[PDB]
């Protein structure tokens, strides 16, 4: 959840 | 509250595949222990406001979730579970909801537009589900939203233009979806945006020129999309940018010079596009740049000499372009440059003297250019070299004085050049070297015996040189070689029987040499060998029985030799053989009674021999042309050149 690509 | 506890207990009773170890076993005594003991439950004024059941092994759905009975919920984290079904619209009824997380579940169906009722929402997390359909445009109403994470779903449709109304949004994560249509230009109104990750979608259209107003975005990931048009120069106004990835798109036009205005850009990925024109000189003013990759494009012209200003440059990928002219010294002048990819271009002239000036370059590729001249001395002494590829150029010079000792070398390719001189024993110092490929050079002299001491070698290719001398029996020490190519040289004497010991050998080519005398009788110990080309040598006498013990043979060429006698019957043990070339020999005697026993042969040639008698019954023999079968003394039972 809620992590940069 | 007691009614809240009852409602959640009824919902809990619908959960399936639950055990007694479940942390929800604490949901007991609803009347007196709801706000004090229930796992995941927390209250204000004795009313539940926080339901955090993340990673509690819950299996079930939200169909019977007690929406109406929990009016005061403000934090819902139901992630890392086995929830299935859809997201009911009643989730929009939690007027106090601030944090909403249904991520890492097996939810399906569309996102209810009723989420746009959640006017207090600041964080929306629905990642790693199978949610399909379009993103509701009413989510654009949630102006307190700080972060939206909808990534790794099956969402389609365009990004709603209402998302430009989310004036407090900082992070937009929509990657790994099937979003389509053009990126709405209203996204440029997101002045609080810091991270915009739309990558790995099917987005089309142009990158909006309004993106230049996103002065606070540090991460722009839009790679692996189908964007067209040009990189707008307004991208150079995103001053906070640290990482800009647009790779694997269908962008065209030139790289804007304004990219040089991005003083904080460390990573720039533009590879796998259709970019054209020259690299602007201003690209050298990206003082922070660490990792510059514009490879696999249609860029033309020279690389700017201003690249010497990129003092933090570590990786430079310019491969597979139409770049031309001489390589400027500044391209390799950074003290921290470790990877310099320049292969598949139209570079000319000689390598600059700056190549490995700091002794830190590790991978260098120059394949298929029009470069020439000598190896610069800083490259000769580049002890940090790990991978170096020079294939397909016109590099010149004494190969002994051109390359120093490379203790960390792993792969080197000198193929298709004009290197002269003799192979030095210095290569043995490359104790980690697994591949040495030097085809098509003017290399002379003998192979130094120290080469056979490189037991770590997997692939050795010295073919198409003018190497001479006899091969020693110490060749057997190449324990781990699998591809050995010495063909097209002036190697003489007998083939060493030590090749027996090259157990890992798969592809062996000793053809087009001056090897004389009988093929080693002992050569029967190559269980992985599927290819052996000994053709065009001075080998003579009978074909040894040892060859027939190489079961894994698929191609076997002993043509253009002076072997005599009969072809052995024992070839039947070569059941995996397909191509067998034995032409231009002095093979005599009748054809073996066998070769019906083989069913894998597809190609054969036995021409220009003294063989006599009838052809056997196999496809290659039926399918042979005149050239395959002519020249023999007494061909076939009925003197035929073709079928039957
Ligand atoms: C969005 O996805 C939902 C859910 O689809 C289901 O989950 C996906 C991750 C995939 O695995 C799908 O293969 C899977 O069905 C879609 O709703 C679903 O639509 C299908 C038909 O397209 C329904 O299947 C029907 O089931 C009934 C019996 O109930 C049969 O009579 C039919 O012959 C057919 O088999 C399925 O029930 C339904 N699931 C629901 C409503 O929960 C939805 O269509 C899709 N939307 C898109 C793609 O725009
Ligand atoms: C429900 O409970 C779990 C377990 O405590 C919570 O997970 C934790 O969530 C916090 C954020 O609220 C995570 O802290 C974060 O750490 C990163 C990296 O250090 C930092 O950059 C962030 O600013 C934030 O502080 C924490 O790591 C995480 N722990 C685990 C084990 O996942 C969860 O957030 C709770 N959810 C709710 C809605 O209460
Ligand atoms: C091609 O071979 C023939 C046959 O010689 C064979 O050689 C032996 C090793 C064995 O395989 C036997 O079957 C044959 O004797 C050559 O003809 C011979 O030539 C030598 C002189 O060089 C002569 O003494 C023999 O009597 C000949 N034998 C026969 C049967 O005629 C022939 O010279 C070879 N040709 C070439 C170009 O090498
Ligand atoms: C929990 O929700 C209930 C409503 O279901 C809230 O009760 C209302 O509170 C307001 C403000 O005091 C009153 O004006 C209403 O008359 C109340 N309605 C009912 C039906 O009781 C309650 O305040 C909420 N509690 C918390 C902590 O949010
Ligand atoms: C955008 O570029 C990609 C390149 O990755 C194109 O995908 C290729 O298209 C052609 C078929 O028309 C082939 O080279 C391959 O089958 C495709 N995949 C590859 C190369 O990985 C894509 O068609 C382009 N989109 C356009 C031009 O609209
Ligand atoms: C840069 O270094 C090595 C030099 O050989 C490149 O090759 C790989 O090296 C690792 C060892 O660390 C091997 O396990 C791989 O098999 C090698 N790959 C190939 C294709 O030979 C490495 O890929 C390079 N890294 C880059 C360019 O990022
Ligand atoms: C073994 O290697 C030789 C080269 O040493 C291959 O010979 C080539 O054969 C093709 C047709 O068969 C000719 O057009 C080439 O001109 C030949 N090259 C040379 C240098 O003579 C031979 O084909 C190989 N054997 C195989 C592949 O079974
Ligand atoms: C429970 O788990 C088993 C095994 O993973 C699975 O076959 C079954 O469908 C699940 N659900 C129910 C209701 O048994
Ligand atoms: C954004 O908000 C304004 C405010 O009234 C509204 O007029 C506009 O329609 C909104 N944008 C979209 C795409 O609905």
Short mmCIF file of C-alpha atoms in Angstrom, two decimals, chain B residues 343-599:
data_model
loop_
_atom_site.label_atom_id
_atom_site.label_comp_id
_atom_site.label_asym_id
_atom_site.label_seq_id
_atom_site.Cartn_x
_atom_site.Cartn_y
_atom_site.Cartn_z
CA UNK B 343 27.03 0.33 -29.00
CA UNK B 344 24.86 0.26 -32.14
CA UNK B 345 25.52 3.82 -33.29
CA UNK B 346 27.48 5.57 -36.05
CA UNK B 347 30.37 6.93 -33.97
CA UNK B 348 33.61 7.50 -35.89
CA UNK B 349 37.15 8.51 -35.04
CA UNK B 350 39.17 7.20 -32.13
CA UNK B 351 38.26 6.59 -28.51
CA UNK B 352 38.89 9.63 -26.29
CA UNK B 353 41.74 9.58 -23.78
CA UNK B 354 39.30 10.08 -20.87
CA UNK B 355 37.66 6.63 -21.04
CA UNK B 356 38.75 5.22 -17.68
CA UNK B 357 40.64 8.21 -16.32
CA UNK B 358 39.39 7.69 -12.76
CA UNK B 359 39.85 3.91 -12.70
CA UNK B 360 36.18 3.22 -11.98
CA UNK B 361 34.59 2.30 -15.33
CA UNK B 362 33.06 -1.17 -15.22
CA UNK B 363 30.97 -1.83 -18.36
CA UNK B 364 31.88 -0.35 -21.76
CA UNK B 365 30.06 -1.23 -24.99
CA UNK B 366 31.09 0.07 -28.42
CA UNK B 367 29.65 -2.65 -30.68
CA UNK B 368 28.78 -1.92 -34.32
CA UNK B 369 30.22 1.57 -34.66
CA UNK B 370 32.69 2.99 -37.18
CA UNK B 371 35.40 3.62 -34.60
CA UNK B 372 39.10 3.08 -35.26
CA UNK B 373 42.53 3.91 -33.89
CA UNK B 374 44.29 2.58 -30.81
CA UNK B 375 43.01 1.72 -27.36
CA UNK B 376 43.65 4.73 -25.08
CA UNK B 377 46.17 4.11 -22.33
CA UNK B 378 43.68 4.86 -19.54
CA UNK B 379 41.58 2.01 -20.93
CA UNK B 380 44.66 -0.24 -21.11
CA UNK B 381 45.15 0.33 -17.36
CA UNK B 382 41.45 0.29 -16.44
CA UNK B 383 41.72 -2.31 -13.68
CA UNK B 384 38.03 -1.87 -12.77
CA UNK B 385 36.88 -3.21 -16.16
CA UNK B 386 34.20 -5.90 -15.89
CA UNK B 387 32.50 -5.90 -19.32
CA UNK B 388 34.08 -4.50 -22.47
CA UNK B 389 32.61 -4.97 -25.95
CA UNK B 390 34.38 -3.71 -29.09
CA UNK B 391 32.74 -5.97 -31.69
CA UNK B 392 32.28 -4.63 -35.21
CA UNK B 393 34.72 -1.72 -35.41
CA UNK B 394 38.15 -1.02 -36.92
CA UNK B 395 40.25 -0.88 -33.76
CA UNK B 396 43.96 -1.38 -34.42
CA UNK B 397 47.14 -2.10 -32.52
CA UNK B 398 49.25 -4.69 -30.77
CA UNK B 399 46.84 -6.76 -28.69
CA UNK B 400 49.67 -7.43 -26.22
CA UNK B 401 50.38 -3.75 -25.46
CA UNK B 402 46.78 -2.55 -25.93
CA UNK B 403 45.24 -4.36 -22.94
CA UNK B 404 46.72 -4.46 -19.44
CA UNK B 405 45.81 -6.83 -16.64
CA UNK B 406 42.08 -6.91 -15.81
CA UNK B 407 41.57 -8.68 -12.46
CA UNK B 408 37.81 -7.97 -12.43
CA UNK B 409 37.14 -8.67 -16.11
CA UNK B 410 34.13 -10.93 -16.73
CA UNK B 411 33.28 -10.54 -20.45
CA UNK B 412 35.36 -9.09 -23.27
CA UNK B 413 34.55 -9.05 -27.00
CA UNK B 414 37.22 -7.99 -29.51
CA UNK B 415 35.45 -9.48 -32.52
CA UNK B 416 35.52 -7.94 -36.00
CA UNK B 417 38.41 -5.53 -35.57
CA UNK B 418 41.97 -5.15 -36.87
CA UNK B 419 43.90 -6.09 -33.73
CA UNK B 420 47.40 -7.41 -34.45
CA UNK B 421 50.10 -9.10 -32.41
CA UNK B 422 50.10 -12.09 -30.10
CA UNK B 423 47.78 -13.07 -27.26
CA UNK B 424 49.58 -12.17 -24.05
CA UNK B 425 49.52 -14.39 -20.94
CA UNK B 426 48.21 -11.34 -19.05
CA UNK B 427 44.66 -12.55 -19.73
CA UNK B 428 45.20 -15.33 -17.18
CA UNK B 429 45.13 -12.62 -14.48
CA UNK B 430 41.42 -12.23 -15.36
CA UNK B 431 40.59 -15.01 -12.92
CA UNK B 432 36.86 -14.18 -13.11
CA UNK B 433 36.70 -14.06 -16.92
CA UNK B 434 33.97 -16.33 -18.29
CA UNK B 435 34.01 -15.27 -21.98
CA UNK B 436 36.82 -14.21 -24.32
CA UNK B 437 35.63 -13.56 -27.89
CA UNK B 438 38.16 -12.22 -30.43
CA UNK B 439 36.88 -13.39 -33.82
CA UNK B 440 37.98 -11.73 -37.08
CA UNK B 441 41.25 -10.08 -36.13
CA UNK B 442 44.81 -10.20 -37.45
CA UNK B 443 46.00 -12.12 -34.38
CA UNK B 444 49.08 -14.28 -34.94
CA UNK B 445 51.47 -16.44 -32.98
CA UNK B 446 50.55 -19.26 -30.61
CA UNK B 447 47.90 -19.43 -27.93
CA UNK B 448 49.91 -18.97 -24.71
CA UNK B 449 49.62 -22.03 -22.45
CA UNK B 450 48.41 -19.82 -19.59
CA UNK B 451 45.07 -19.60 -21.42
CA UNK B 452 44.37 -23.25 -20.62
CA UNK B 453 44.83 -22.39 -16.92
CA UNK B 454 41.65 -20.24 -17.03
CA UNK B 455 39.40 -22.98 -15.66
CA UNK B 456 36.59 -20.45 -15.09
CA UNK B 457 36.34 -19.82 -18.85
CA UNK B 458 32.97 -20.79 -20.31
CA UNK B 459 33.33 -19.43 -23.85
CA UNK B 460 36.56 -18.96 -25.82
CA UNK B 461 36.40 -17.74 -29.42
CA UNK B 462 39.68 -17.14 -31.27
CA UNK B 463 38.23 -18.04 -34.67
CA UNK B 464 39.12 -16.34 -37.99
CA UNK B 465 42.61 -15.23 -36.96
CA UNK B 466 46.06 -16.27 -38.15
CA UNK B 467 46.98 -18.10 -34.93
CA UNK B 468 49.54 -20.88 -35.42
CA UNK B 469 51.30 -23.68 -33.56
CA UNK B 470 50.12 -27.00 -32.20
CA UNK B 471 47.54 -27.31 -29.42
CA UNK B 472 49.03 -28.77 -26.22
CA UNK B 473 47.45 -31.52 -24.15
CA UNK B 474 47.10 -28.96 -21.34
CA UNK B 475 43.97 -27.78 -23.18
CA UNK B 476 42.23 -30.38 -21.00
CA UNK B 477 42.40 -27.94 -18.06
CA UNK B 478 39.48 -25.84 -19.42
CA UNK B 479 37.06 -27.72 -17.19
CA UNK B 480 34.09 -25.36 -17.62
CA UNK B 481 34.35 -24.32 -21.27
CA UNK B 482 31.19 -25.04 -23.26
CA UNK B 483 31.70 -23.01 -26.46
CA UNK B 484 35.21 -23.51 -27.91
CA UNK B 485 35.82 -21.93 -31.33
CA UNK B 486 39.34 -22.10 -32.77
CA UNK B 487 38.27 -22.47 -36.40
CA UNK B 488 39.69 -20.50 -39.31
CA UNK B 489 43.28 -20.37 -38.08
CA UNK B 490 46.64 -21.93 -38.99
CA UNK B 491 46.73 -24.38 -36.07
CA UNK B 492 48.68 -27.52 -36.95
CA UNK B 493 49.72 -30.91 -35.62
CA UNK B 494 47.36 -33.49 -34.19
CA UNK B 495 44.15 -32.54 -32.42
CA UNK B 496 45.06 -33.05 -28.74
CA UNK B 497 43.41 -35.98 -27.02
CA UNK B 498 43.04 -33.77 -23.93
CA UNK B 499 39.89 -32.28 -25.45
CA UNK B 500 38.41 -35.54 -24.09
CA UNK B 501 38.42 -33.87 -20.66
CA UNK B 502 36.36 -30.80 -21.69
CA UNK B 503 33.29 -32.46 -20.20
CA UNK B 504 31.24 -29.25 -20.25
CA UNK B 505 31.92 -28.72 -23.96
CA UNK B 506 28.71 -28.25 -25.96
CA UNK B 507 29.80 -26.45 -29.15
CA UNK B 508 33.22 -27.38 -30.57
CA UNK B 509 34.58 -25.95 -33.83
CA UNK B 510 38.15 -26.79 -34.90
CA UNK B 511 37.38 -26.51 -38.62
CA UNK B 512 39.42 -24.69 -41.27
CA UNK B 513 42.84 -25.36 -39.75
CA UNK B 514 45.91 -27.47 -40.50
CA UNK B 515 45.19 -30.26 -38.01
CA UNK B 516 46.75 -33.45 -39.38
CA UNK B 517 46.79 -37.20 -38.65
CA UNK B 518 44.02 -39.32 -37.14
CA UNK B 519 41.13 -37.92 -35.14
CA UNK B 520 41.92 -38.86 -31.50
CA UNK B 521 40.63 -42.35 -30.78
CA UNK B 522 39.96 -41.47 -27.13
CA UNK B 523 37.55 -38.62 -27.96
CA UNK B 524 34.46 -40.22 -26.44
CA UNK B 525 33.94 -38.30 -23.17
CA UNK B 526 31.84 -35.26 -24.17
CA UNK B 527 28.31 -36.05 -22.95
CA UNK B 528 27.04 -32.47 -23.48
CA UNK B 529 28.51 -32.02 -26.98
CA UNK B 530 25.82 -31.33 -29.59
CA UNK B 531 28.03 -29.73 -32.27
CA UNK B 532 31.43 -30.71 -33.65
CA UNK B 533 32.88 -29.14 -36.80
CA UNK B 534 36.27 -30.57 -37.81
CA UNK B 535 35.83 -29.87 -41.52
CA UNK B 536 38.49 -28.42 -43.83
CA UNK B 537 41.52 -29.89 -42.05
CA UNK B 538 44.25 -32.41 -42.93
CA UNK B 539 42.82 -35.22 -40.80
CA UNK B 540 43.08 -38.73 -42.23
CA UNK B 541 42.53 -42.44 -41.52
CA UNK B 542 39.40 -44.14 -40.20
CA UNK B 543 36.61 -42.30 -38.39
CA UNK B 544 37.20 -43.33 -34.76
CA UNK B 545 34.75 -45.38 -32.72
CA UNK B 546 35.02 -42.79 -29.95
CA UNK B 547 32.95 -40.25 -31.89
CA UNK B 548 30.00 -42.67 -31.80
CA UNK B 549 29.91 -42.50 -27.98
CA UNK B 550 28.89 -38.79 -28.07
CA UNK B 551 25.17 -39.49 -27.79
CA UNK B 552 24.16 -35.83 -27.58
CA UNK B 553 25.62 -35.03 -31.01
CA UNK B 554 23.19 -33.17 -33.29
CA UNK B 555 25.53 -31.70 -35.94
CA UNK B 556 28.72 -33.50 -36.99
CA UNK B 557 30.86 -32.19 -39.87
CA UNK B 558 34.02 -34.07 -40.87
CA UNK B 559 33.98 -32.83 -44.46
CA UNK B 560 36.94 -31.67 -46.55
CA UNK B 561 39.42 -34.08 -44.98
CA UNK B 562 41.27 -37.23 -45.98
CA UNK B 563 39.48 -39.80 -43.85
CA UNK B 564 39.34 -43.29 -45.38
CA UNK B 565 37.77 -46.68 -44.71
CA UNK B 566 34.13 -47.42 -44.11
CA UNK B 567 31.56 -45.40 -42.20
CA UNK B 568 31.03 -47.29 -38.92
CA UNK B 569 27.79 -49.11 -38.23
CA UNK B 570 28.10 -47.92 -34.61
CA UNK B 571 26.76 -44.49 -35.58
CA UNK B 572 23.43 -46.00 -34.47
CA UNK B 573 24.34 -44.87 -30.95
CA UNK B 574 24.04 -41.29 -32.31
CA UNK B 575 20.25 -41.35 -32.22
CA UNK B 576 20.07 -37.60 -31.51
CA UNK B 577 22.07 -36.79 -34.65
CA UNK B 578 20.30 -34.68 -37.28
CA UNK B 579 22.96 -33.21 -39.60
CA UNK B 580 25.92 -35.37 -40.67
CA UNK B 581 28.37 -33.98 -43.26
CA UNK B 582 31.07 -36.36 -44.53
CA UNK B 583 31.75 -34.99 -48.01
CA UNK B 584 35.08 -34.52 -49.82
CA UNK B 585 36.84 -37.50 -48.24
CA UNK B 586 38.26 -40.86 -49.32
CA UNK B 587 35.67 -42.92 -47.47
CA UNK B 588 35.17 -46.32 -49.07
CA UNK B 589 33.32 -49.60 -48.60
CA UNK B 590 29.62 -50.40 -48.55
CA UNK B 591 26.97 -48.42 -46.72
CA UNK B 592 26.16 -49.86 -43.25
CA UNK B 593 23.23 -52.28 -42.93
CA UNK B 594 21.89 -49.88 -40.27
CA UNK B 595 20.82 -46.19 -40.58
CA UNK B 596 17.27 -47.39 -40.63
CA UNK B 597 17.70 -47.45 -36.84
CA UNK B 598 18.07 -43.64 -36.85
CA UNK B 599 14.99 -41.48 -37.23
#
